[PDB]
From a paper:
The two bacterial crystal structures were solved at a resolution of 2.0 Å, and each chain (A and B in SdAAO and A in ShAAO) shows one FAD molecule and one alcohol molecule in the active pocket (a hexane-1,6-diol (HEZ) molecule in SdAAO, and a triethylene glycol (PGE) molecule in ShAAO) derived from the corresponding crystallization conditions. Interestingly, both structures have a substrate analogue molecule bound in the active-site cavity, with the site being highly accessible. This internal cavity is located in front of the re side of the FAD isoalloxazine and flanked by V90, F468, H469, and H514 in SdAAO, and by F92, F455, H456, and H500 in ShAAO, similarly to that described for PeAAO. Thus, the position of H469 in SdAAO and H456 in ShAAO corresponds to the highly conserved active site histidine residue that activates alcohol substrate by proton abstraction during the reductive half-reaction in the majority of GMC oxidoreductases. In contrast, bacterial structures lack this protruding α-helix and the equivalent loops (compressing residues 353–364 and 356–379 in ShAAO and SdAAO, respectively) adopt a conformation that does not cover the entrance to the channel to the same extent as PeAAO does, creating wide and unblocked active sites, especially in SdAAO structure. Thus, the surface areas covering the access channel and active-site pocket were established to be approximately 2026 Å2 for SdAAO and 1383 Å2 for ShAAO considerably higher than the 903 Å2 estimated for PeAAO. Interestingly, the fully accessible catalytic tunnel of SdAAO is similar to that of previously described for the fungal AAO from T. thermophilus, despite significant differences in the general folding of both proteins, particularly in the substrate-binding domain which might be responsible for its lower catalytic efficiency. On the other hand, SdAAO preferentially oxidized aromatic primary alcohols, showing the highest activities with cinnamyl, 4-nitrobenzyl, and 4-bromobenzyl alcohols (390%, 255%, and 119%, respectively) which resembles the scope reported for fungal AAOs. Notably, SdAAO displayed greater affinity (up to a 326-fold lower Km) than ShAAO, which resulted in higher catalytic efficiencies for SdAAO across the panel, except for 2,4-hexadien-1-ol and 1-octanol, ranging from 30 to 286-fold higher efficiencies compared to those obtained for ShAAO.
In this study, two new extracellular bacterial AAOs from S. deajeonense and S. hiroshimensis (SdAAO and ShAAO) were produced as active proteins and biochemically and structurally characterized. For alcohol oxidation, FAD-AOx utilize the flavin cofactor as the hydride acceptor, which is regenerated upon reaction via aerobic oxidation, yielding H2O2 as the by-product. In both proteins, the FAD-binding domain consists of a five-stranded parallel β-sheet interrupted by a three-stranded antiparallel β-sheet that connects with two antiparallel β-strands, along with seven α-helices.
Author numbering: 1 to 534
Write the structure that this text describes.
Protein backbone atom coordinates (compact mmCIF):
# COMPACT_ATOMS: atom_id res chain seq x y z
CA UNK A 1 0.00 0.00 0.00
CA UNK A 2 1.21 3.53 -0.86
CA UNK A 3 0.64 6.30 1.71
CA UNK A 4 0.29 10.05 1.36
CA UNK A 5 0.49 10.58 5.13
CA UNK A 6 1.79 8.69 8.14
CA UNK A 7 0.39 9.73 11.52
CA UNK A 8 2.35 8.65 14.59
CA UNK A 9 0.10 8.05 17.62
CA UNK A 10 -3.58 7.10 17.65
CA UNK A 11 -4.15 8.97 20.90
CA UNK A 12 -6.37 12.02 21.25
CA UNK A 13 -5.38 14.25 18.28
CA UNK A 14 -3.95 11.63 15.90
CA UNK A 15 -7.32 9.81 15.41
CA UNK A 16 -9.11 13.03 14.53
CA UNK A 17 -6.60 13.72 11.78
CA UNK A 18 -6.68 10.18 10.38
CA UNK A 19 -10.50 10.34 10.28
CA UNK A 20 -10.67 13.76 8.58
CA UNK A 21 -7.89 13.22 6.05
CA UNK A 22 -9.42 9.95 4.73
CA UNK A 23 -12.72 11.71 3.96
CA UNK A 24 -11.02 12.33 0.58
CA UNK A 25 -10.98 8.94 -1.20
CA UNK A 26 -7.64 9.47 -2.96
CA UNK A 27 -5.67 10.30 0.23
CA UNK A 28 -4.13 7.18 1.79
CA UNK A 29 -3.28 7.48 5.50
CA UNK A 30 -1.28 5.16 7.73
CA UNK A 31 -2.04 5.55 11.47
CA UNK A 32 0.53 3.93 13.78
CA UNK A 33 0.00 3.20 17.50
CA UNK A 34 2.41 1.62 20.02
CA UNK A 35 -0.41 0.19 22.15
CA UNK A 36 -3.28 -2.14 21.19
CA UNK A 37 -6.93 -1.43 20.50
CA UNK A 38 -9.03 -0.22 23.42
CA UNK A 39 -10.41 -3.63 24.46
CA UNK A 40 -9.91 -3.53 28.25
CA UNK A 41 -13.43 -2.69 29.38
CA UNK A 42 -12.25 -1.78 32.91
CA UNK A 43 -10.69 1.33 31.36
CA UNK A 44 -14.18 2.47 30.26
CA UNK A 45 -15.80 2.42 33.71
CA UNK A 46 -16.19 6.01 35.08
CA UNK A 47 -15.68 5.05 38.73
CA UNK A 48 -13.04 2.32 38.26
CA UNK A 49 -11.00 3.20 35.14
CA UNK A 50 -7.98 4.28 37.22
CA UNK A 51 -7.33 0.63 38.03
CA UNK A 52 -5.65 0.39 34.60
CA UNK A 53 -3.00 2.98 35.56
CA UNK A 54 0.37 1.27 35.88
CA UNK A 55 -0.67 -1.49 33.45
CA UNK A 56 0.12 -2.02 29.75
CA UNK A 57 -2.35 0.82 29.02
CA UNK A 58 0.21 3.27 30.49
CA UNK A 59 3.75 4.45 29.56
CA UNK A 60 4.27 4.64 33.40
CA UNK A 61 6.69 7.59 33.26
CA UNK A 62 7.64 9.61 36.36
CA UNK A 63 9.31 13.02 36.58
CA UNK A 64 12.86 13.57 37.65
CA UNK A 65 13.07 14.52 41.32
CA UNK A 66 11.47 17.95 41.73
CA UNK A 67 13.44 20.30 43.99
CA UNK A 68 10.33 22.53 44.31
CA UNK A 69 8.27 19.54 45.53
CA UNK A 70 10.58 18.36 48.35
CA UNK A 71 12.56 16.24 45.84
CA UNK A 72 9.55 14.08 44.99
CA UNK A 73 9.42 12.21 41.71
CA UNK A 74 5.93 12.81 40.25
CA UNK A 75 4.09 9.87 38.65
CA UNK A 76 3.28 11.17 35.18
CA UNK A 77 1.09 8.58 33.37
CA UNK A 78 0.07 8.73 29.71
CA UNK A 79 -2.06 6.38 27.62
CA UNK A 80 -0.68 3.55 25.50
CA UNK A 81 -3.69 2.32 23.57
CA UNK A 82 -5.88 3.56 20.71
CA UNK A 83 -7.30 6.60 22.51
CA UNK A 84 -4.06 7.44 24.27
CA UNK A 85 -4.57 9.37 27.47
CA UNK A 86 -8.25 9.90 26.66
CA UNK A 87 -8.57 6.12 27.27
CA UNK A 88 -7.21 6.32 30.84
CA UNK A 89 -8.40 9.72 32.15
CA UNK A 90 -11.32 10.80 34.34
CA UNK A 91 -12.80 12.06 31.06
CA UNK A 92 -13.86 15.59 32.07
CA UNK A 93 -14.43 18.01 29.20
CA UNK A 94 -13.32 21.37 30.55
CA UNK A 95 -12.09 23.23 27.54
CA UNK A 96 -10.95 26.58 28.97
CA UNK A 97 -11.86 30.18 28.08
CA UNK A 98 -11.74 32.82 25.36
CA UNK A 99 -8.45 34.23 26.66
CA UNK A 100 -6.89 30.74 26.46
CA UNK A 101 -7.68 30.29 22.77
CA UNK A 102 -6.92 33.91 21.88
CA UNK A 103 -3.54 33.73 23.62
CA UNK A 104 -2.18 31.24 21.04
CA UNK A 105 -2.59 33.87 18.31
CA UNK A 106 -1.24 36.60 20.57
CA UNK A 107 1.98 34.63 21.06
CA UNK A 108 2.52 34.19 17.29
CA UNK A 109 0.11 31.50 16.00
CA UNK A 110 -1.92 33.47 13.49
CA UNK A 111 -5.40 32.05 12.93
CA UNK A 112 -5.59 30.12 16.23
CA UNK A 113 -8.11 32.01 18.35
CA UNK A 114 -11.37 31.64 20.25
CA UNK A 115 -13.47 32.30 17.15
CA UNK A 116 -11.90 29.36 15.36
CA UNK A 117 -12.18 27.28 18.55
CA UNK A 118 -15.95 27.91 18.73
CA UNK A 119 -16.26 26.86 15.06
CA UNK A 120 -14.38 23.63 15.79
CA UNK A 121 -16.35 22.88 19.00
CA UNK A 122 -19.53 22.84 16.85
CA UNK A 123 -17.98 19.92 14.95
CA UNK A 124 -16.47 18.29 18.09
CA UNK A 125 -19.10 18.56 20.82
CA UNK A 126 -22.35 16.63 21.15
CA UNK A 127 -23.88 18.00 24.35
CA UNK A 128 -27.33 18.91 25.67
CA UNK A 129 -25.71 22.27 26.51
CA UNK A 130 -26.11 22.88 22.76
CA UNK A 131 -27.16 23.92 20.24
CA UNK A 132 -25.75 27.38 20.97
CA UNK A 133 -22.91 29.66 19.94
CA UNK A 134 -20.85 27.98 22.73
CA UNK A 135 -21.69 24.27 22.24
CA UNK A 136 -22.40 21.73 19.51
CA UNK A 137 -25.35 19.37 19.78
CA UNK A 138 -24.43 17.17 16.81
CA UNK A 139 -20.63 16.88 16.87
CA UNK A 140 -18.50 13.74 17.06
CA UNK A 141 -17.84 13.58 20.82
CA UNK A 142 -20.79 12.81 23.09
CA UNK A 143 -20.62 14.64 26.42
CA UNK A 144 -22.78 13.76 29.45
CA UNK A 145 -23.08 15.20 32.96
CA UNK A 146 -21.08 13.36 35.61
CA UNK A 147 -23.25 10.82 37.39
CA UNK A 148 -23.43 11.15 41.17
CA UNK A 149 -25.39 9.43 44.00
CA UNK A 150 -25.85 12.26 46.45
CA UNK A 151 -28.03 15.43 46.58
CA UNK A 152 -25.13 17.03 48.47
CA UNK A 153 -23.74 18.11 45.06
CA UNK A 154 -26.31 20.95 45.23
CA UNK A 155 -24.92 22.08 48.63
CA UNK A 156 -21.43 22.39 47.08
CA UNK A 157 -22.74 24.48 44.18
CA UNK A 158 -24.68 26.74 46.59
CA UNK A 159 -21.61 27.09 48.81
CA UNK A 160 -19.51 28.42 45.92
CA UNK A 161 -22.21 30.99 45.12
CA UNK A 162 -22.68 31.94 48.78
CA UNK A 163 -18.92 32.45 49.14
CA UNK A 164 -18.97 35.05 46.35
CA UNK A 165 -16.82 32.90 44.01
CA UNK A 166 -19.23 33.37 41.08
CA UNK A 167 -22.40 31.88 39.62
CA UNK A 168 -23.85 28.44 39.11
CA UNK A 169 -23.79 27.64 35.38
CA UNK A 170 -21.66 26.80 32.36
CA UNK A 171 -18.03 27.90 32.85
CA UNK A 172 -17.42 27.18 29.13
CA UNK A 173 -20.31 29.51 28.19
CA UNK A 174 -20.88 33.26 28.53
CA UNK A 175 -19.86 33.55 32.20
CA UNK A 176 -16.50 31.77 32.90
CA UNK A 177 -16.62 32.55 36.64
CA UNK A 178 -19.10 29.76 37.31
CA UNK A 179 -19.43 26.36 38.96
CA UNK A 180 -21.08 23.45 37.19
CA UNK A 181 -21.35 19.71 37.12
CA UNK A 182 -18.55 18.55 34.83
CA UNK A 183 -19.48 16.85 31.56
CA UNK A 184 -17.42 13.83 30.50
CA UNK A 185 -16.73 11.64 27.44
CA UNK A 186 -19.18 8.94 28.54
CA UNK A 187 -22.22 7.55 26.74
CA UNK A 188 -24.54 5.38 28.81
CA UNK A 189 -21.98 5.33 31.67
CA UNK A 190 -19.29 3.95 29.31
CA UNK A 191 -16.24 5.84 28.07
CA UNK A 192 -16.35 6.84 24.44
CA UNK A 193 -13.07 8.40 23.46
CA UNK A 194 -12.44 10.75 20.56
CA UNK A 195 -10.77 7.74 18.88
CA UNK A 196 -13.94 5.65 19.34
CA UNK A 197 -15.94 8.57 17.96
CA UNK A 198 -13.72 9.40 14.95
CA UNK A 199 -12.46 5.89 14.05
CA UNK A 200 -15.86 4.17 13.85
CA UNK A 201 -16.59 0.94 11.95
CA UNK A 202 -17.47 3.07 8.92
CA UNK A 203 -14.24 5.05 9.02
CA UNK A 204 -12.07 1.99 9.57
CA UNK A 205 -13.75 0.27 6.59
CA UNK A 206 -12.35 2.98 4.29
CA UNK A 207 -9.82 1.47 1.89
CA UNK A 208 -7.61 4.55 2.12
CA UNK A 209 -7.06 4.24 5.91
CA UNK A 210 -4.64 1.70 7.41
CA UNK A 211 -4.33 1.43 11.19
CA UNK A 212 -1.48 -0.64 12.64
CA UNK A 213 -1.38 -1.22 16.44
CA UNK A 214 1.63 -2.58 18.33
CA UNK A 215 3.69 -0.34 16.05
CA UNK A 216 6.39 1.49 17.97
CA UNK A 217 7.95 4.34 16.01
CA UNK A 218 11.66 4.76 16.70
CA UNK A 219 12.53 7.73 14.49
CA UNK A 220 11.53 9.84 11.51
CA UNK A 221 13.38 9.24 8.25
CA UNK A 222 14.74 12.03 6.05
CA UNK A 223 16.17 12.70 2.62
CA UNK A 224 18.10 15.89 3.26
CA UNK A 225 15.77 18.12 5.31
CA UNK A 226 12.68 16.42 3.86
CA UNK A 227 10.73 13.95 6.02
CA UNK A 228 9.96 10.85 3.93
CA UNK A 229 9.05 8.06 6.38
CA UNK A 230 9.42 6.40 9.79
CA UNK A 231 11.39 3.53 11.27
CA UNK A 232 8.83 1.42 13.10
CA UNK A 233 8.90 -1.76 15.11
CA UNK A 234 5.98 -4.07 14.42
CA UNK A 235 5.89 -7.25 16.51
CA UNK A 236 9.63 -7.43 17.29
CA UNK A 237 10.79 -6.62 13.75
CA UNK A 238 11.73 -3.27 12.21
CA UNK A 239 10.27 -1.80 9.00
CA UNK A 240 10.68 1.50 7.18
CA UNK A 241 7.33 2.96 6.12
CA UNK A 242 7.12 5.89 3.68
CA UNK A 243 4.80 8.79 2.91
CA UNK A 244 4.67 10.67 -0.39
CA UNK A 245 3.36 13.91 1.22
CA UNK A 246 4.05 14.22 4.95
CA UNK A 247 4.73 12.74 8.38
CA UNK A 248 2.51 13.94 11.26
CA UNK A 249 3.67 13.44 14.86
CA UNK A 250 0.83 12.99 17.34
CA UNK A 251 2.81 11.08 19.99
CA UNK A 252 1.98 13.55 22.79
CA UNK A 253 3.92 16.00 24.97
CA UNK A 254 6.46 13.43 26.22
CA UNK A 255 7.15 11.24 23.17
CA UNK A 256 6.84 13.79 20.28
CA UNK A 257 9.94 15.82 21.41
CA UNK A 258 11.82 12.58 22.13
CA UNK A 259 11.14 11.34 18.57
CA UNK A 260 12.15 14.71 17.10
CA UNK A 261 15.45 14.71 19.02
CA UNK A 262 16.30 11.09 18.16
CA UNK A 263 15.58 11.95 14.52
CA UNK A 264 18.03 14.88 14.39
CA UNK A 265 15.55 17.74 15.00
CA UNK A 266 16.32 19.64 18.19
CA UNK A 267 18.83 21.69 20.20
CA UNK A 268 22.24 21.33 18.56
CA UNK A 269 24.21 21.00 21.81
CA UNK A 270 22.12 18.12 23.20
CA UNK A 271 22.01 16.23 19.89
CA UNK A 272 25.79 16.60 19.37
CA UNK A 273 26.43 15.43 22.95
CA UNK A 274 24.68 12.18 22.01
CA UNK A 275 26.32 11.93 18.57
CA UNK A 276 22.97 12.52 16.80
CA UNK A 277 23.43 14.27 13.42
CA UNK A 278 21.67 17.63 13.49
CA UNK A 279 19.34 17.83 10.50
CA UNK A 280 17.67 20.95 11.92
CA UNK A 281 18.81 23.00 14.90
CA UNK A 282 15.51 23.69 16.67
CA UNK A 283 16.27 24.99 20.22
CA UNK A 284 12.59 24.93 21.23
CA UNK A 285 12.20 21.12 20.99
CA UNK A 286 11.75 19.76 24.51
CA UNK A 287 11.67 23.28 26.02
CA UNK A 288 8.66 25.12 27.45
CA UNK A 289 7.30 22.02 29.24
CA UNK A 290 4.45 23.09 31.49
CA UNK A 291 1.72 21.44 33.47
CA UNK A 292 -0.82 22.10 36.22
CA UNK A 293 -0.46 21.19 39.89
CA UNK A 294 -3.38 20.44 42.21
CA UNK A 295 -3.54 20.62 46.00
CA UNK A 296 -6.55 19.08 47.75
CA UNK A 297 -8.22 20.62 50.80
CA UNK A 298 -9.98 17.87 52.79
CA UNK A 299 -12.89 18.30 55.24
CA UNK A 300 -14.43 15.71 57.57
CA UNK A 301 -18.11 16.16 58.50
CA UNK A 302 -20.05 15.31 61.65
CA UNK A 303 -23.24 15.53 59.54
CA UNK A 304 -24.21 12.58 57.32
CA UNK A 305 -23.87 13.14 53.58
CA UNK A 306 -26.46 10.80 52.12
CA UNK A 307 -25.27 7.98 49.85
CA UNK A 308 -21.75 9.50 49.73
CA UNK A 309 -19.94 6.38 51.00
CA UNK A 310 -19.64 3.53 48.48
CA UNK A 311 -17.05 1.25 46.90
CA UNK A 312 -16.86 1.58 43.07
CA UNK A 313 -14.16 -1.15 42.96
CA UNK A 314 -16.18 -4.03 44.51
CA UNK A 315 -16.97 -7.12 42.42
CA UNK A 316 -20.70 -6.45 42.92
CA UNK A 317 -20.37 -2.85 41.71
CA UNK A 318 -18.30 -3.82 38.68
CA UNK A 319 -20.69 -6.67 37.81
CA UNK A 320 -23.69 -4.37 38.14
CA UNK A 321 -21.86 -2.06 35.71
CA UNK A 322 -21.12 -4.80 33.16
CA UNK A 323 -24.71 -6.04 33.42
CA UNK A 324 -26.74 -2.84 32.98
CA UNK A 325 -24.29 0.09 33.32
CA UNK A 326 -25.57 1.22 36.73
CA UNK A 327 -24.47 1.07 40.35
CA UNK A 328 -21.50 2.37 42.42
CA UNK A 329 -18.92 1.93 39.62
CA UNK A 330 -20.76 4.73 37.76
CA UNK A 331 -19.55 7.31 40.26
CA UNK A 332 -16.31 9.26 40.20
CA UNK A 333 -16.12 11.55 43.33
CA UNK A 334 -14.80 14.62 41.44
CA UNK A 335 -18.13 15.83 40.01
CA UNK A 336 -18.14 19.65 39.97
CA UNK A 337 -15.71 22.37 38.95
CA UNK A 338 -15.75 26.12 39.51
CA UNK A 339 -13.53 28.89 38.15
CA UNK A 340 -12.62 31.95 40.24
CA UNK A 341 -10.80 35.27 40.14
CA UNK A 342 -9.10 35.31 43.54
CA UNK A 343 -8.14 39.01 43.19
CA UNK A 344 -11.51 40.17 41.85
CA UNK A 345 -10.14 41.59 38.56
CA UNK A 346 -11.90 39.01 36.36
CA UNK A 347 -9.02 39.16 33.83
CA UNK A 348 -9.10 35.37 33.36
CA UNK A 349 -9.71 32.77 36.05
CA UNK A 350 -6.60 32.21 38.20
CA UNK A 351 -7.83 29.09 40.08
CA UNK A 352 -10.00 26.07 39.39
CA UNK A 353 -11.77 24.42 42.30
CA UNK A 354 -12.76 20.78 41.81
CA UNK A 355 -15.32 19.43 44.31
CA UNK A 356 -15.98 15.94 45.70
CA UNK A 357 -18.72 14.81 48.11
CA UNK A 358 -16.16 12.71 50.08
CA UNK A 359 -13.25 13.81 52.31
CA UNK A 360 -10.72 11.85 50.17
CA UNK A 361 -8.60 11.31 53.31
CA UNK A 362 -5.91 8.60 53.46
CA UNK A 363 -5.98 8.82 57.28
CA UNK A 364 -2.36 9.99 57.67
CA UNK A 365 -3.41 13.67 57.65
CA UNK A 366 -2.17 15.02 61.00
CA UNK A 367 -5.41 16.93 61.66
CA UNK A 368 -7.44 13.70 61.34
CA UNK A 369 -5.11 11.62 63.55
CA UNK A 370 -7.65 10.88 66.30
CA UNK A 371 -10.69 10.19 64.05
CA UNK A 372 -12.09 6.68 64.30
CA UNK A 373 -13.02 4.81 61.13
CA UNK A 374 -12.17 7.81 58.92
CA UNK A 375 -13.29 5.92 55.80
CA UNK A 376 -16.81 5.51 57.20
CA UNK A 377 -17.10 9.24 58.00
CA UNK A 378 -18.77 11.84 55.78
CA UNK A 379 -16.94 14.83 54.32
CA UNK A 380 -16.04 16.82 51.21
CA UNK A 381 -12.97 18.18 49.43
CA UNK A 382 -11.94 21.07 47.21
CA UNK A 383 -8.95 20.62 44.93
CA UNK A 384 -7.21 23.90 44.12
CA UNK A 385 -5.40 24.31 40.78
CA UNK A 386 -3.18 27.25 39.88
CA UNK A 387 -4.33 27.64 36.29
CA UNK A 388 -1.50 29.72 34.80
CA UNK A 389 1.84 28.59 36.33
CA UNK A 390 4.83 30.55 35.07
CA UNK A 391 7.28 27.67 35.73
CA UNK A 392 8.71 26.05 32.59
CA UNK A 393 10.82 22.90 32.28
CA UNK A 394 12.30 20.42 29.86
CA UNK A 395 11.86 17.10 28.16
CA UNK A 396 15.36 15.70 27.59
CA UNK A 397 16.72 12.51 26.04
CA UNK A 398 18.26 9.97 28.43
CA UNK A 399 20.14 8.26 25.59
CA UNK A 400 19.97 7.46 21.87
CA UNK A 401 18.19 4.21 22.69
CA UNK A 402 14.65 4.55 21.26
CA UNK A 403 13.13 2.45 24.07
CA UNK A 404 14.53 4.54 26.96
CA UNK A 405 12.04 6.79 28.73
CA UNK A 406 12.56 10.56 28.21
CA UNK A 407 13.56 12.65 31.24
CA UNK A 408 10.57 14.73 32.28
CA UNK A 409 11.31 17.87 34.31
CA UNK A 410 8.39 20.37 34.70
CA UNK A 411 10.48 22.43 37.17
CA UNK A 412 7.39 22.85 39.34
CA UNK A 413 7.56 25.98 41.54
CA UNK A 414 10.80 27.11 39.84
CA UNK A 415 9.07 30.43 39.14
CA UNK A 416 8.61 32.07 42.55
CA UNK A 417 5.24 33.59 41.63
CA UNK A 418 3.68 30.08 41.48
CA UNK A 419 3.95 29.36 45.23
CA UNK A 420 3.09 33.00 46.10
CA UNK A 421 -0.21 32.74 44.18
CA UNK A 422 -0.95 29.13 45.23
CA UNK A 423 -0.89 30.00 48.96
CA UNK A 424 -3.33 32.86 48.29
CA UNK A 425 -5.57 30.52 46.29
CA UNK A 426 -5.81 28.06 49.18
CA UNK A 427 -6.81 30.82 51.62
CA UNK A 428 -9.33 32.21 49.12
CA UNK A 429 -10.86 28.77 48.66
CA UNK A 430 -11.04 28.13 52.43
CA UNK A 431 -13.62 30.96 52.73
CA UNK A 432 -16.11 28.45 51.35
CA UNK A 433 -16.15 26.59 54.69
CA UNK A 434 -17.79 29.69 56.26
CA UNK A 435 -20.90 29.55 54.05
CA UNK A 436 -24.33 28.62 55.40
CA UNK A 437 -24.30 25.63 53.01
CA UNK A 438 -20.92 24.16 54.00
CA UNK A 439 -20.18 25.32 57.60
CA UNK A 440 -22.53 22.51 58.89
CA UNK A 441 -20.32 19.93 57.12
CA UNK A 442 -16.92 21.36 58.15
CA UNK A 443 -15.79 19.70 61.39
CA UNK A 444 -12.07 19.11 60.76
CA UNK A 445 -9.90 20.42 57.89
CA UNK A 446 -6.60 19.55 56.16
CA UNK A 447 -4.84 21.92 56.11
CA UNK A 448 -6.24 23.38 59.33
CA UNK A 449 -8.17 26.61 58.79
CA UNK A 450 -5.74 28.34 61.22
CA UNK A 451 -2.57 26.99 59.54
CA UNK A 452 0.33 29.38 59.01
CA UNK A 453 1.68 30.23 55.54
CA UNK A 454 4.71 28.06 56.42
CA UNK A 455 2.52 25.04 57.15
CA UNK A 456 0.46 25.60 53.96
CA UNK A 457 3.63 25.97 51.85
CA UNK A 458 5.09 22.78 53.32
CA UNK A 459 1.88 20.84 52.63
CA UNK A 460 1.72 22.10 49.07
CA UNK A 461 5.35 21.13 48.40
CA UNK A 462 4.77 17.66 49.89
CA UNK A 463 1.29 16.89 48.58
CA UNK A 464 0.63 18.90 45.39
CA UNK A 465 0.72 16.74 42.26
CA UNK A 466 0.33 16.84 38.47
CA UNK A 467 -3.14 17.26 37.04
CA UNK A 468 -1.87 15.33 33.99
CA UNK A 469 -1.88 18.31 31.60
CA UNK A 470 1.67 18.41 30.11
CA UNK A 471 1.97 20.70 27.07
CA UNK A 472 4.37 22.88 25.17
CA UNK A 473 7.43 20.79 24.13
CA UNK A 474 6.96 21.53 20.39
CA UNK A 475 5.46 24.98 20.78
CA UNK A 476 3.52 26.53 17.90
CA UNK A 477 4.40 30.15 17.24
CA UNK A 478 6.12 32.56 14.86
CA UNK A 479 9.12 30.61 13.62
CA UNK A 480 10.36 33.64 11.64
CA UNK A 481 10.78 35.92 14.65
CA UNK A 482 10.79 33.60 17.71
CA UNK A 483 13.91 31.43 18.05
CA UNK A 484 12.17 29.05 20.53
CA UNK A 485 9.07 28.34 18.44
CA UNK A 486 9.13 24.83 17.03
CA UNK A 487 6.20 24.70 14.62
CA UNK A 488 4.49 27.46 12.66
CA UNK A 489 0.80 28.36 12.32
CA UNK A 490 0.48 25.47 9.83
CA UNK A 491 2.00 23.03 12.37
CA UNK A 492 5.09 22.60 10.16
CA UNK A 493 8.38 21.93 11.92
CA UNK A 494 10.94 24.62 11.36
CA UNK A 495 14.02 23.76 9.30
CA UNK A 496 12.24 20.75 7.79
CA UNK A 497 9.89 20.01 4.90
CA UNK A 498 6.99 17.51 5.03
CA UNK A 499 6.87 17.17 8.86
CA UNK A 500 4.08 18.49 11.11
CA UNK A 501 3.20 18.10 14.82
CA UNK A 502 -0.37 17.92 16.05
CA UNK A 503 -0.95 17.05 19.72
CA UNK A 504 -0.60 18.68 23.17
CA UNK A 505 3.07 19.39 22.50
CA UNK A 506 2.20 22.34 20.21
CA UNK A 507 -0.04 24.01 22.85
CA UNK A 508 1.99 27.01 24.19
CA UNK A 509 0.60 26.99 27.72
CA UNK A 510 -1.88 25.08 29.83
CA UNK A 511 -5.49 26.29 29.63
CA UNK A 512 -7.96 27.39 32.34
CA UNK A 513 -9.23 23.85 32.27
CA UNK A 514 -8.11 20.41 31.18
CA UNK A 515 -6.18 19.57 28.03
CA UNK A 516 -8.25 16.86 26.23
CA UNK A 517 -10.63 19.40 24.69
CA UNK A 518 -7.99 21.81 23.23
CA UNK A 519 -6.13 18.70 21.94
CA UNK A 520 -9.22 17.59 19.94
CA UNK A 521 -9.40 21.20 18.71
CA UNK A 522 -5.78 20.85 17.55
CA UNK A 523 -6.74 17.66 15.64
CA UNK A 524 -9.68 19.37 13.86
CA UNK A 525 -7.49 22.41 13.12
CA UNK A 526 -4.61 20.31 11.76
CA UNK A 527 -7.02 18.44 9.51
CA UNK A 528 -8.46 21.65 8.00
CA UNK A 529 -5.00 23.17 7.57
CA UNK A 530 -3.61 20.10 5.82
CA UNK A 531 -6.63 19.59 3.57
CA UNK A 532 -6.46 23.27 2.49
CA UNK A 533 -2.79 22.87 1.51
CA UNK A 534 -3.63 19.95 -0.82
C1 LIG B 1 -4.37 9.99 34.20
C2 LIG B 1 -4.77 11.14 33.30
C3 LIG B 1 -5.95 11.82 33.56
C4 LIG B 1 -6.37 12.90 32.75
N1 LIG B 1 -7.62 13.44 32.98
C5 LIG B 1 -8.06 14.33 32.09
C6 LIG B 1 -9.42 14.78 32.19
O1 LIG B 1 -10.28 14.22 32.85
N2 LIG B 1 -9.78 15.68 31.19
C7 LIG B 1 -8.93 16.27 30.25
O2 LIG B 1 -9.36 17.16 29.49
N3 LIG B 1 -7.63 15.85 30.21
C8 LIG B 1 -7.25 14.91 31.05
N4 LIG B 1 -5.97 14.40 30.92
C9 LIG B 1 -5.11 14.96 29.85
C10 LIG B 1 -5.50 14.58 28.44
O3 LIG B 1 -6.03 13.26 28.52
C11 LIG B 1 -4.29 14.73 27.51
O4 LIG B 1 -3.77 16.06 27.68
C12 LIG B 1 -4.62 14.44 26.04
O5 LIG B 1 -5.39 13.23 25.94
C13 LIG B 1 -3.30 14.27 25.31
O6 LIG B 1 -3.62 14.09 23.93
P1 LIG B 1 -2.45 13.81 22.88
O7 LIG B 1 -3.02 13.33 21.60
O8 LIG B 1 -1.46 14.92 22.92
O9 LIG B 1 -1.63 12.57 23.51
P2 LIG B 1 -1.94 11.07 23.94
O10 LIG B 1 -3.42 11.00 24.11
O11 LIG B 1 -1.00 10.62 25.02
O12 LIG B 1 -1.69 10.33 22.53
C14 LIG B 1 -0.36 9.94 22.17
C15 LIG B 1 -0.45 8.59 21.50
O13 LIG B 1 0.78 8.30 20.78
C16 LIG B 1 1.15 6.97 21.05
N5 LIG B 1 2.59 6.90 20.89
C17 LIG B 1 3.52 7.63 21.60
N6 LIG B 1 4.76 7.37 21.28
C18 LIG B 1 4.64 6.47 20.23
C19 LIG B 1 5.61 5.86 19.42
N7 LIG B 1 6.92 6.12 19.52
N8 LIG B 1 5.17 5.01 18.47
C20 LIG B 1 3.85 4.82 18.34
N9 LIG B 1 2.83 5.33 19.04
C21 LIG B 1 3.31 6.17 19.98
C22 LIG B 1 0.66 6.73 22.48
O14 LIG B 1 0.64 5.36 22.78
C23 LIG B 1 -0.70 7.41 22.44
O15 LIG B 1 -1.83 6.65 22.00
C24 LIG B 1 -5.55 13.32 31.69
C25 LIG B 1 -4.33 12.67 31.47
C26 LIG B 1 -4.00 11.51 32.16
C27 LIG B 1 -2.70 10.82 31.87
Amino acid sequence: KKFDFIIVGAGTAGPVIASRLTEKEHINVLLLEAGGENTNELSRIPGAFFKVLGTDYDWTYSSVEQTGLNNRSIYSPSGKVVGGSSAINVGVWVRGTKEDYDSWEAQGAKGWNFSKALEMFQKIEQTNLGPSKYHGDKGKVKLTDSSYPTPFVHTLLNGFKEAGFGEIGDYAGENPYSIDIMQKIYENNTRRTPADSYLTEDVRARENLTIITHAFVRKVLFEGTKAIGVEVEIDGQIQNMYASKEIILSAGTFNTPKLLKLSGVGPREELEKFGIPVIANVPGVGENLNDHLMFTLKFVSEKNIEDSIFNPLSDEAIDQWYKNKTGPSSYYPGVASGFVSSDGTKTGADFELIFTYTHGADGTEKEFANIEDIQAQSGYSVTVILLQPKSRGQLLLASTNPYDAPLINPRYFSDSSDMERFIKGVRYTQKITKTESLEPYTYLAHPALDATDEIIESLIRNEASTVFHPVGTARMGDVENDSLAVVDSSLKVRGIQGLRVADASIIPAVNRGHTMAPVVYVGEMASEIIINDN
